[PDB]
Amino acid sequence: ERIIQQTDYDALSCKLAAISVGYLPSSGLQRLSVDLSKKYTEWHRSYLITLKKFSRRAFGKVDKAMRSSFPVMNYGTYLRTVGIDAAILEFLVANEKVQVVNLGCGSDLRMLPLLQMFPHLAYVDIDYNESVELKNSILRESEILRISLGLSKEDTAKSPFLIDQGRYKLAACDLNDITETTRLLDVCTKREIPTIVISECLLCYMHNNESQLLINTIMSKFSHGLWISYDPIGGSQPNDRFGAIMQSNLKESRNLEMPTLMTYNSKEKYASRWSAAPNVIVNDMWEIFNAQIPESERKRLRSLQFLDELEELKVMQTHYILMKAQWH
Ligand SMILES: C[S@@+](CC[C@H](N)C(=O)[O-])C[C@H]1O[C@@H](n2cnc3c(N)ncnc32)[C@H](O)[C@@H]1O
């Protein structure tokens, strides 16, 4: 599905806006060095310019959305990114030899600093064929991105990978197809290695059968895991139109669906999908803003742009959640 694939352009636009303004990198929360903080910005800037070489249409969409980004949206992107990263980093620090599987990775570049930071990390990026082909093109065309992953300019990887370069793999898969998915995982991961699974704005685009089988199958496949999921929720308090409005706005405007947004309309309902894991934690992103962001960071962000409407930020961010499920 082209339309589902193109939701990544929004995610990338948001990432680039946050970096351009300076919300990210957050060197404390993302545990970046002086050099990697610089590279973080450089890598993303290069991605954008390289995207332009490969697609006028995609660049246009990203470019226009990124320059029109509002502060409330930038705070969202910041919270989403440092929330996920904080969870990843705690686990990688504790477990030196680990494998990360990023499900529906789109244009995500968090592997670039992570692979440098953690010598025994192995990382697998998975998305639809058309999406990974574009990412592969970009990563190999840009000199600084090539250097960051040790890539040849040429496509030297053999099916089933587009990149198969040591501790990093990029592979096409339709994650609605569990047989394809398990066959892929069988040749790029091992059962016994501690595993982080990432689903950042992936599961919201799936029907419940597909998302549940994906969760159940992948938790069954690895002995020792942490699943970090980020997604919107419809909202549970009465007279909360957020979910209804979002679904209507997405169908009307873009012919896009979020099939379980109203089903899993609270953080509790959402987290229940991982109830086979013994250790499940869920917070909305306002809770993250108030309890996990240090005061030093709130002050920094206040220096970048005016957030004139803090309540509006709250109303939005209570509709995004970060779920951490751990099993062994
Ligand atoms: C909103 S984007 C998020 C991308 C990235 N995780 C991020 O947060 O920046 C959703 C991504 O999930 C991918 N996706 C959705 N359904 C998929 C499926 N059935 N198989 C593989 N990828 C899928 C899309 O192609 C897209 O790149």
Report the number of distinct structural domains present in the chain: 1
- Give the span between the Cα atoms of 318 and 328, in whole angstroms: 30
Residue 80 annotated as binding?
yes
> What does each C-alpha distance from 202 to 127, 147, 187 come to in angstroms?
10, 28, 22
- 117: domain range? 1-328
For 195, phi then psi, to 5°, come to -130, 135
H or E element at residue 164: strand 161-164
Q: Is the dihedral of CA 321, 1, 256, 211 positive or negative?
A: negative
- Give the span between the Cα atoms of 204 and 191, in whole angstroms: 27
- Give the span between the Cα atoms of 210 and 311, in whole angstroms: 35
Give Dmax over CA atoms of the chain in angstroms.
Answer: 55
Residue 31 carries which side chain, given as an amino acid letter?
R
Least Cα distance to 235 among 280, 258, 275, 267 occurs for 267
* Cβ of 125 below 6 Å from ligand 1: no
> What does each C-alpha distance from 246 to 104, 242, 316, 320 come to in angstroms?
21, 6, 11, 13
Rounded to a whole number of angstroms, the CA Rg of the chain reads 19
- Give the span between the Cα atoms of 325 and 6, in whole angstroms: 28
**Cβ neighbours, 10 Å, residue 157:** 17
* Cβ of 105 below 6 Å from ligand 1: yes
> What does each C-alpha distance from 62 to 7, 14, 199 come to in angstroms?
11, 9, 22
CATH of the domain at 195: 3.40.50.150
Are 22 and 304 within 8 A, CB to CB?
yes
Separation of CA 299 and ligand 1 centre (Å): 33
Are 201 and 11 within 8 A, CB to CB?
yes
* Cβ of 174 below 6 Å from ligand 1: yes
3 state SS of 14: helix
CB-based contacts of 156: which residues, under 8 Å, 6+ apart? none
For 197, phi then psi, to 5°, come to -105, 130
Q: Which atom of ligand 1 lies closest to the CA of 174?
A: 20
DSSP output for 207-256: -HHHHHHHHHHHHHH-SSEEEEEEEE----STT--HHHHHHHHHHHHH--
Reported resolution in A? 1.8
**Peptide bond before residue 160 is cis, with ω within 30 degrees of 0:** yes
Separation of CA 2 and ligand 1 centre (Å): 11
- Give the span between the Cα atoms of 160 and 175, in whole angstroms: 15
For residue 306, the 8-state DSSP code is: -
CB-based contacts of 249: which residues, under 8 Å, 6+ apart? none
Are 323 and 227 within 8 A, CB to CB?
yes
For residue 272, the 8-state DSSP code is: G
Residue 269 carries which side chain, given as an amino acid letter?
K
* Cβ of 104 below 6 Å from ligand 1: yes
> What does each C-alpha distance from 49 to 16, 141, 145 come to in angstroms?
11, 11, 12
- Give the span between the Cα atoms of 103 and 319, in whole angstroms: 21
- Give the span between the Cα atoms of 64 and 53, in whole angstroms: 16
